[PDB]
């Protein structure tokens, strides 16, 4: 199974909340954005956070989110 833990979800949620205008639907673009605007020690965590940011962008584009 591929279920994101609470650290990835909280990091992606505060990334969506705090830096919203400089984002997009491309995984590599917001991957580089999350590389530069935060400090992630590893790379798998960076890729998982960027993927959840992309999914949250696709969710915001349809409507509001209660987080």
């Amino acid at each position: 199974g591929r279920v994101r833990t609470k650290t990835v979800k909280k990091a992606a949620r505060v990334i969506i909340e705090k830096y919203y205008t400089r984002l997009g639907n491309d995984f590599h673009t917001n991957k580089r954005v999350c590389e530069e605007i935060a400090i992630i020690p590893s790379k798998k965590l960076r890729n998982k956070i960027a993927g959840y940011v992309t999914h949250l962008m696709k969710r915001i584009q349809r409507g509001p989110v209660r987080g």
Partner: protein, 313 residues
């Protein structure tokens, strides 16, 4: 006024097409760089089944190649890729003469000079690097530059006012002089990050496009903003027709063309192949280039194809 009609697609890529370039020297050649590591040189056939065929694949990069420009003699090529290096290709053998080294982040855009001696390059880092023909930097500005990512850098077409325009994500589009290599005019007032700028071939007015969908026009000789018109979706690519007084934009999944004499839309180049009604997202255009005669327009999509368009009337 007129109508823009498609003629075909160029199949053979595997990623999103990032840059398209053509030259007056070879009207039957389209040189395109995609998301994949190869750069495909197309040979035009004008057939009923396929418009063009690939002629030579240019490899040597290790990541996403983003920009490519062809030199004035029609035998050289310059590519900016994310690996942080630039390559000076040969169109006769497929080899690389010199490799540019010095960038530390992903490279966004490169450009040849008008006299084909100077190289400018904007990258993810906050530096703009001036190179020679032989891969050696002359003077790279790093301290007084963009505060974040640099999207596009372009030259003047004329040497009477040899400036270079530079747009980046910091909502500050700038003008640098070629001689003393310093800022001359900075321009403010654009909401959202920038994607591209394009210089008209007469070297008088420039067009700017970013996130908000406003195609903002400026001037090269004086730093006065001309006007601002809406484009709808996010503007990715911009170009000027060489002979006709036009300006074309890539606004999401559609291409908008306007008349620059009287400000009105000429045509709406939407996705006329309406087939993705099964809860889908339309593919977007990331690159487009006019021809040398302003007759055939080629656009780069995210559906692994390059569409061609021709003027009927």
């Amino acid at each position: 006024t007129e109508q823009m009609t498609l003629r075909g697609t160029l199949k053979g890529h595997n990623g999103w097409v990032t840059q398209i370039a053509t030259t007056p020297q070879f009207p039957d050649m389209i040189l395109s760089a995609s998301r994949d590591k190869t750069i495909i040189m197309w040979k035009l056939t004008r057939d009923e089944t396929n418009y063009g065929i690939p002629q030579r694949a240019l490899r040597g990069h290790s990541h996403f190649v983003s920009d490519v420009v062809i030199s004035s003699d029609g035998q050289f090529a310059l590519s900016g890729s994310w690996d942080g290096t630039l390559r000076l290709w040969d169109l006769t053998t497929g080899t690389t003469t010199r490799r540019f080294v010095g960038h530390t982040k992903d490279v966004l855009s490169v450009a040849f000079s008008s006299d084909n001696r100077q190289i400018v390059s904007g990258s993810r880092d906050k530096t703009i690097k001036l190179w020679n023909t032989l891969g050696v930097c002359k003077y790279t500005v790093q301290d007084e530059s963009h505060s974040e990512w640099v999207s596009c850098v372009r030259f003047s077409p004329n040497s009477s006012n040899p400036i270079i325009v530079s747009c980046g994500w910091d909502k500050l589009v700038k003008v640098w002089n070629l001689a003393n290599c310093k800022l001359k005019t900075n321009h403010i007032g654009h909401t959202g990050y920038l994607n591209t700028v394009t210089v008209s071939p007469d070297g008088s007015l420039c067009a700017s496009g970013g996130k908000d969908g406003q195609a903002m026009l400026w001037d090269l000789n004086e730093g006065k903003h001309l006007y601002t018109l809406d484009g709808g979706d996010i503007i990715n690519a911009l170009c000027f027709s060489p002979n006709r007084y036009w300006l074309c934009a890539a606004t999401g999944p559609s291409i908008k063309i306007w008349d620059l004499e009287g400000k009105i839309i000429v045509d709406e180049l939407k996705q006329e192949v309406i087939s993705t009604s099964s809860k889908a997202e339309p593919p977007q255009c990331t690159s487009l280039a006019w021809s040398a005669d302003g007759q055939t327009l080629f656009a780069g999509y995210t559906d692994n194809l390059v569409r061609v368009w021709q003027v009927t009337i």
